[PDB]
C-alpha cells in the first residue's frame, strides 16, 4: 500500500486593483482611469 499525494486546487484570491493601487484616494483613482482597463483585465483573470 503506497501513497500518492496530488494537489487539486489552491487558494481563491481576489484583489481590488483600484484599492491596492489607490486605497481610498480619489485623485489616484481619477489618475488611474487613464490607464484604461488594466484593472478589469486583472480582476477577470483572477476570477477565472
Amino acid at each position: 500500500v503506497t501513497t500518492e499525494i496530488l494537489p487539486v486546487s489552491m487558494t481563491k484570491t481576489s484583489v481590488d486593483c483600484t484599492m491596492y493601487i489607490c486605497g481610498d484616494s480619489t485623485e489616484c483613482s481619477n489618475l488611474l482611469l487613464q490607464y484604461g482597463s488594466f484593472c478589469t483585465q486583472l480582476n477577470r483573470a483572477l476570477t477565472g
Partner: protein, 48 residues
C-alpha cells in the same frame, strides 16, 4: 442607468442589455466615514 439597481449595474459591468444566468461581481462595497477627526497636541505658544 448603472446605479439604479443591481441588475442595471451588472448590465453596465458586462456592457450588455442581456445577462445570462450566473453570479457576477459588479463592484466593491466599503463603509464610508461618518465624520472627520483632528488630534493635534495641546500647544499654544506661537512660533517665534
Amino acid at each position: 442607468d448603472c446605479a439604479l439597481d443591481p441588475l442595471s449595474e451588472t448590465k453596465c459591468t458586462l456592457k450588455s442589455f442581456t445577462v445570462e444566468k450566473g453570479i457576477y461581481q459588479t463592484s466593491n462595497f466599503r463603509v464610508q466615514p461618518t465624520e472627520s477627526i483632528v488630534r493635534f497636541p495641546n500647544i499654544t505658544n506661537l512660533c517665534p
